[PDB]
Design an enzyme around this catalytic site. Structure first.
Site, PDB file in Angstrom:
ATOM      1  CB  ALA B  12      -0.929  -0.005   1.210  1.00  0.00           C
ATOM      2  CE1 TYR B 215      -8.800  -2.009  -5.062  1.00  0.00           C
ATOM      3  CE2 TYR B 215      -6.735  -2.292  -3.887  1.00  0.00           C
ATOM      4  CZ  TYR B 215      -8.046  -2.660  -4.111  1.00  0.00           C
ATOM      5  OH  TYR B 215      -8.604  -3.682  -3.383  1.00  0.00           O
ATOM      6  CG  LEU B 243       6.612  18.068   8.872  1.00  0.00           C
ATOM      7  CD1 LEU B 243       5.229  18.017   8.272  1.00  0.00           C
ATOM      8  CD2 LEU B 243       7.531  17.129   8.135  1.00  0.00           C
ATOM      9  CD  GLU B 245       3.449  26.574  13.439  1.00  0.00           C
ATOM     10  OE1 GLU B 245       4.184  27.455  13.923  1.00  0.00           O
ATOM     11  OE2 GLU B 245       2.247  26.433  13.738  1.00  0.00           O
TER      12      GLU B 245
END
Ligand SMILES: CC(=O)O[C@H]1[C@H]2[C@H]([C@@H]3[C@@H](O)[C@@H]4[C@H]([C@H](C)C[C@]5(O)OC(=O)[C@@](C)(O)[C@]45C)[C@@]3(C)[C@H]1OC(C)=O)[C@@H](O)C(=O)[C@H]1C[C@@H]3O[C@@H]3[C@H](OC(C)=O)[C@]21C
Ligand SMILES: CC(=O)O[C@H]1[C@H]2[C@H]([C@@H]3[C@@H](O)[C@@H]4[C@H]([C@H](C)C[C@]5(O)OC(=O)[C@@](C)(O)[C@]45C)[C@@]3(C)[C@H]1OC(C)=O)[C@@H](O)C(=O)[C@H]1C[C@@H]3O[C@@H]3[C@H](OC(C)=O)[C@]21C
Ligand SMILES: Nc1nc2c(ncn2[C@@H]2O[C@H](COP(=O)(O)CP(=O)(O)OP(=O)(O)O)[C@@H](O)[C@H]2O)c(=O)[nH]1
Ligand SMILES: Nc1nc2c(ncn2[C@@H]2O[C@H](COP(=O)(O)CP(=O)(O)OP(=O)(O)O)[C@@H](O)[C@H]2O)c(=O)[nH]1
Ligand SMILES: Nc1nc2c(ncn2[C@@H]2O[C@H](COP(=O)(O)OP(=O)(O)OP(=O)(O)O)[C@@H](O)[C@H]2O)c(=O)[nH]1
Ligand SMILES: [Mg+2]
EC number: 3.6.5.-
Lengths: 426, 428, 426
Positions: B12, B215, B243, B245
């Site tokens: 995935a 998918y 990032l 924060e």
């Protein structure tokens, strides 16, 4: 003005000398006919170090080829770049040694060393101001080891004040090739302790690992390795031929490397190494070269570096670089690994930079390390000797040719002395 | 001068990263060859002269998707060292992904992380995509997360997890995977967004007017959400976030760190002609419950922390008026002890659409992240499944034959009951 | 001869300062190339209050920019009017704080404090007799509030008798933009009550109502709000740079307003504020200015100014006016509203008039009020803070940096002490 002649002994030495003259004629931009087709003016003003002029604008390479088996001489005569040698140089006998050190040191040497010594006397008289000689041989067989060591002892008692290089392969731990190997190996080390300034070592299987995991080839050959030994030889001798921002010829490296006289066995390395497929992505900087340098995988000997302590490091670079970068990065590598270097030798690194890189690269670098951990290799040699010396196997073949047991005991004693001398400073 | 390194673990993860790096290489105008005919250093490294490398590690213990990548059209882009491949799959077993097979591959990927961390200066965090129900995609995730929180210490780490659905099921051992993975990842990871499949199915069926998704459409949606998050780092804005924060806005206590992510607008090109899109209707349409990417009822709890990122040309006075008319309603109730639960972010760049995709050129976009309460009721549902598969000692020998003890499942059940009761205590 | 250096800290004050140097550089007539192109000699006799002439009649401003994420500095430097700042001034870090006051105070502040103090020490020693320092930071975020706090503490440790200006946007009643905002507000007020002579509070919602109900704007962006703040700052310090008929520098204001040395939070305002739609229906004489000044909905703080009484009022005027009109209409305004003013201070006006207007308009005015009704805003901070402190919410991101709970209790007692002071005098 500085002058070096060449002497090739042994099969492995004859092939790697053929590849050595190959890469020299490709680096200096000359043709297999001997005629000139180069471009720059830098490639001819220093041609006196490896060649000689002749009546008719013909050039001769300065080499002497010795063996006892004329098959390999026919091989280097028939192939390409076999033309340039002079036909007064191809000296050999007819018998062969059969991988027996006693015959090569005590029987065939009496027939061949006279003629070889006379020709090398005339050739060393032909030059102005000689620096030193360098030989290429092995440590496993009978012709190369015995004839090389006998010639080297005669050369040391003749010229007592000049340098020597020996690019010799040493035995492998995993798989052997010859059954008579440790006898001639220990006796060859017993001569190389006495008669030689400096000698680098090659192991074949580490070259196999490098050619497998980093070069990524499907069919590794003998010639490829020979070319890697050749590139080491050229990248060491590359300061006598081109000017640079800090030059360093061979006596300077000899006095920078050895602290003691008997600690004169080094391990070489090359950089940068990348394959064909993975070539484009990583860069060609001094960080990537200095990272690829200090590894256990770069080392061309069967010895782990981080099982012992480095004594000295000499890094000879080729290209157009920036000096404060390589000094700051040498400082970074010295500060990173403090447990790996000798404490009473401060600033353990030596740096040299030459201008002209090898053709085909924008930068290159050669590494020479002197680390004591190679005593381990000596251990896995010398202990093996005791096994055969517990049962006295294969001995009467050597013994019938005029050789005694007591010299075997004294050669093992000297090998014990050197391995304990490595063991003391560790 | 601000960097971030992304890793992909499991099937995935590697397919969702295929979609994410497709959107990234489409975004800055770069060809898939890796050349371009000065801020994109934030995700890329420069290669010598006229080449670029992405910052990625695609680690899979099953070789077929890596071979599909190397045969795929993005073959020339990456560096061929950074595709680390094992020799045997995990077969949806957590112990084979954490202990048995996966421990032989951790040294290569850790050397790869340490080599990619050396070429940068001010490294901010990692973004690792992984799934719950699979074996290697959760076990190896646990191992890498524990090892990196040991090694690097005080840097950030954000995840994207695929949530296992209550109703729909594909594997049969998925409650075991999720329960043991949450048992072992609760301490060390910083904040991990949860995303389900079946809510993406429903918003694909009802709002974009599609009948049958493949998918790649779900992966296009999640990749658009990822790009909408990090678009405040890739360019500039009037009121910017980065990032480091979200940890100060989304994580009240060092245990509850589970938000759900949402996107807007979800429309086709034919529904996009007959509606002019103000900021008020889309900010209200963030709170309709049918558009939340996790099957849960947000009316069954309260909202604790709520962050918003805007994209496109939006002026801020109507933004402040839209939040003011949001808070005054009755159904969207908030937690008592948190009166200011809003973190607003605006960027100048409008989003782009993938050719052959499912989005039309819409000038605006909203991303909304919510740490709400009622998701833990879904936890109870998930926990209830575990009780079934422990009441008869089902499938226990396939797990204990690989080097596990029985008390770990009881400790996991105790930890999950502890998490739920901490939750309901804080709520009520 | 009186000099002021400029420090911008955080993102908000950095954008405010970009528009501030925009407005001042447009007003004094100097070009973004640095070369002078004004019209009169009235400008160039007083340019040394802010700028320096540098070796080939190019001028530099006296600014030092401070942040922890570089992209704000890139957006200022690459943009227009980014050439005149001297590149030795830009000092920043690389990590960032991100709404963590302990990160903006304790950890990165100790990494950047010595470099910023060194640059401001050189900039202060280069000057003759400096009157004040001014900083622009925000009260919400981490790097702005924390580094402005630590910088002000270090500066008032260094210089004991120099005044400090500080423009600080204050948190909102309706909707916040950060989540941990009352903690930042309470600690920032806890230090600003200790170390600052004058400071100002600006709301965002008052600026929104100003650009809506009086200006009739449709698309307000952040640069425009920053232009309003730039206009108020230039209107306050236009007296230092140009001749006056009742002049008022910064120290005159500092000894004018404060009755007691803790109550120095002002609310400013600007007049006139005209739209192009309703420009023709108005005239522009001093009743229009004095009626638009003393106004409920024209205040730049989201507090109704008639929710109490006033303490002191200062008014700085710009344009060719008449003085008898000014003081008789100030007595008229105090005559109209007897309830709104403290009686134990009579003559609750302070006036000043300078000559030069802003570029294009004839008359303008800057209103400054020390009132007590702002206590309501103080209540809506501390109440909120107490609720979060009742549940120990979000404390661990601070607590793992080095801050303790006694800091929060001391700061809460200080804020309730300050509202006790403001409720004492009404
Ligand atoms: C690193 C590399 O692939 O170099 C090739 C050589 C070339 C090798 C060539 O000699 C090849 C070798 C092959 C790998 C092996 C080879 O086919 O068998 C041999 O014994 C070699 C070494 O002589 C043969 C014929 C080659 C391809 C290669 O030799 C190897 C594998 O070391 C060599 O001829 C060149 O011209 C070099 C020129 C430029 O420097 C680069 C390359 O070498 C170096 C030192 O980087 C060369 C293209
Ligand atoms: C006040 C007004 O609406 O007029 C504009 C400015 C002009 C502003 C201009 O700077 C605009 C601003 C816009 C409202 C916003 C703006 O686009 O973004 C900015 O950051 C501004 C403020 O620099 C920009 C570029 C404008 C239009 C407006 O700046 C504002 C809104 O304060 C400004 O350049 C002038 O020259 C002024 C001169 C005459 O006084 C009038 C006007 O200003 C005053 C004092 O009312 C100006 C024409
Ligand atoms: N790198 C290379 N190593 C080689 C090559 N040929 C041989 N060798 C190595 O040399 C080692 C030693 O060989 P020797 O010199 O002892 C052969 P010897 O002189 O004993 O016999 P003759 O060849 O019959 O004269 C051998 O075991 C191999 O490891 C070659 O082409 N390249
Ligand atoms: N007048 C302006 N206010 C702004 C602007 N951008 C942000 N802000 C104000 O910022 C306030 C919150 O403080 P900030 O987040 O800006 C300080 P921050 O934490 O971002 O600093 P850093 O840590 O240096 O990133 C909020 O009330 C906004 O109204 C702007 O361009 N103009
Ligand atoms: N959104 C999305 N989910 C996917 C996709 N492919 C698989 N999944 C989900 O992956 C979950 C199973 O976990 P996996 O990661 O595939 O299993 P694994 O880690 O590969 O384990 P092994 O099979 O042993 O290699 C299923 O529930 C799928 O819904 C995809 O392309 N997009
Ligand atoms: Mg799988």
């Amino acid at each position: 003005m500085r002058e070096i002649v060449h002497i090739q002994a042994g099969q492995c030495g004859n092939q790697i000398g053929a590849k050595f003259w190959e890469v020299i004629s490709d680096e200096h931009g000359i043709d297999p006919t001997g005629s000139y087709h180069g471009d720059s003016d830098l490639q001819l003003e220093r041609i006196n170090v490896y060649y000689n002029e002749a009546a008719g604008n013909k050039y001769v390479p300065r080499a002497i080829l010795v063996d006892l088996e004329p098959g390999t001489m026919d091989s280097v005569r028939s192939g390409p770049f076999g033309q340039i040698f002079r036909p007064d140089n191809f000296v050999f006998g007819q018998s062969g040694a059969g991988n027996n050190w006693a015959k090569g040191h005590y029987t065939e040497g009496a027939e061949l060393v006279d003629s070889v010594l006379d020709v090398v006397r005339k050739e060393s008289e032909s030059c102005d101001c000689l620096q030193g000689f360098q030989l290429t041989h092995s440590l496993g067989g009978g012709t190369g080891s015995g004839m090389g060591t006998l010639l080297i002892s005669k050369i040391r008692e003749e010229y007592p004040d000049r340098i020597m290089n020996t690019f010799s392969v040493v035995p492998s731990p995993k798989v052997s090739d010859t059954v008579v190997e440790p006898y001639n190996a220990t006796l060859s080390v017993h001569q190389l302790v006495e008669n030689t300034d400096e000698t680098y070592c090659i192991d074949n299987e580490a070259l196999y690992d490098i050619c497998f995991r980093t070069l990524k080839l499907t069919t590794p050959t003998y010639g490829d390795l020979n070319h890697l030994v050749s590139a080491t030889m050229s990248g060491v001798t590359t300061c006598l031929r081109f000017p640079g921002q800090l030059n360093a010829d061979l006596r300077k490296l000899a006095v920078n490397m050895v602290p003691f006289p008997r600690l004169h066995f080094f391990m070489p390395g090359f950089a940068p190494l990348t394959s064909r497929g993975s070539q484009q992505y990583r860069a060609l900087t001094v960080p990537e070269l200095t990272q690829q340098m200090f590894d256990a995988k770069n080392m061309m000997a069967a010895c782990d570096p981080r099982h012992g302590r480095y004594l000295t490091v000499a890094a000879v670079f080729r290209g157009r670089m920036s000096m404060k970068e390589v000094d700051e990065q040498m400082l970074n590598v010295q500060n990173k690994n403090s447990s790996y270097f000798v404490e009473w030798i401060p600033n353990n690194v030596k740096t040299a930079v030459c201008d002209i890189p090898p053709r085909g690269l924008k930068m290159s670098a050669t590494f020479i390390g002197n680390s004591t951990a190679i005593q381990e290799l000596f251990k896995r040699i010398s202990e093996q000797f005791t096994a055969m010396f517990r049962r006295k196997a294969f001995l009467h073949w050597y013994t019938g040719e005029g050789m005694d047991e007591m010299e075997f005991t004294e050669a093992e004693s000297n090998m014990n002395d050197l391995v304990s001398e490595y063991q003391q400073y560790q | 001068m601000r960097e971030c390194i992304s890793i992909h673990v499991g099937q995935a993860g590697v397919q969702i990263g295929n979609a994410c790096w497709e959107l990234y290489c489409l975004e800055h105008g770069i060809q898939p060859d890796g050349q371009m005919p000065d801020s994109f250093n934030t995700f890329f490294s420069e290669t010598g002269a006229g080449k670029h490398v992405p910052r990625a590690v695609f680690v899979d213990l099953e070789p077929t998707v890596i071979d599909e990548v190397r045969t795929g059209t993005y073959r020339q882009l990456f560096h061929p060292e950074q595709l680390i491949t094992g020799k045997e799959d995990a077969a949806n077993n957590y112990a084979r992904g954490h202990y048995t097979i996966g421990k032989e591959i951790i040294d290569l990927v850790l050397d790869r992380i340490r080599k990619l961390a050396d070429q940068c200066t001010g490294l901010q965090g990692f973004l690792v995509f992984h799934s719950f129900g699979g074996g290697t995609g959760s076990g190896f995730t646990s191992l890498l997360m524990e090892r990196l929180s040991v090694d690097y210490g005080k840097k950030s780490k954000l995840e994207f997890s695929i949530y296992p659905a209550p109703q729909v099921s594909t594997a049969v051992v998925e409650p075991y995977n999720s329960i043991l993975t949450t048992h072992t990842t609760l301490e060390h990871s910083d904040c991990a967004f949860m995303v389900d499949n079946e809510a993406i199915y429903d918003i694909c069926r009802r709002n974009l007017d599609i009948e049958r998704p493949t998918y790649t459409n779900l992966n296009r949606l999640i990749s658009q959400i990822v790009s909408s998050i990090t678009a405040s780092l890739r360019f500039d804005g009037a009121l910017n976030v980065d990032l480091t924060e979200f940890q100060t806005n989304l994580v009240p206590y060092p245990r509850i760190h589970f938000p759900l992510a949402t996107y807007a607008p979800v429309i086709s090109a034919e529904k996009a002609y007959h509606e002019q899109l103000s900021v008020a209707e889309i900010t209200n349409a963030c709170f309709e419950p049918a558009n939340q990417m996790v099957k849960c009822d947000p009316r069954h709890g309260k909202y604790m922390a709520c962050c918003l990122l805007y994209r496109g040309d939006v002026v801020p006075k109507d933004v402040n008026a839209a939040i003011a008319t949001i808070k005054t309603k009755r159904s969207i109730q908030f937690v008592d002890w948190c009166p200011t639960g809003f973190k607003v972010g605006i960027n100048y760049q409008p989003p782009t659409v993938v050719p052959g995709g499912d989005l039309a050129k819409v000038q605006r976009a909203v991303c909304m992240l919510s740490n709400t309460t009622a998701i833990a009721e879904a936890w109870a549902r998930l926990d209830h499944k575990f009780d079934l598969m422990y009441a008869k000692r089902a499938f226990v020998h396939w797990y204990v034959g690989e080097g596990m003890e029985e008390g770990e499942f009881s400790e996991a059940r105790e930890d999950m009951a502890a998490l739920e009761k901490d939750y309901e205590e804080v709520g009520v």
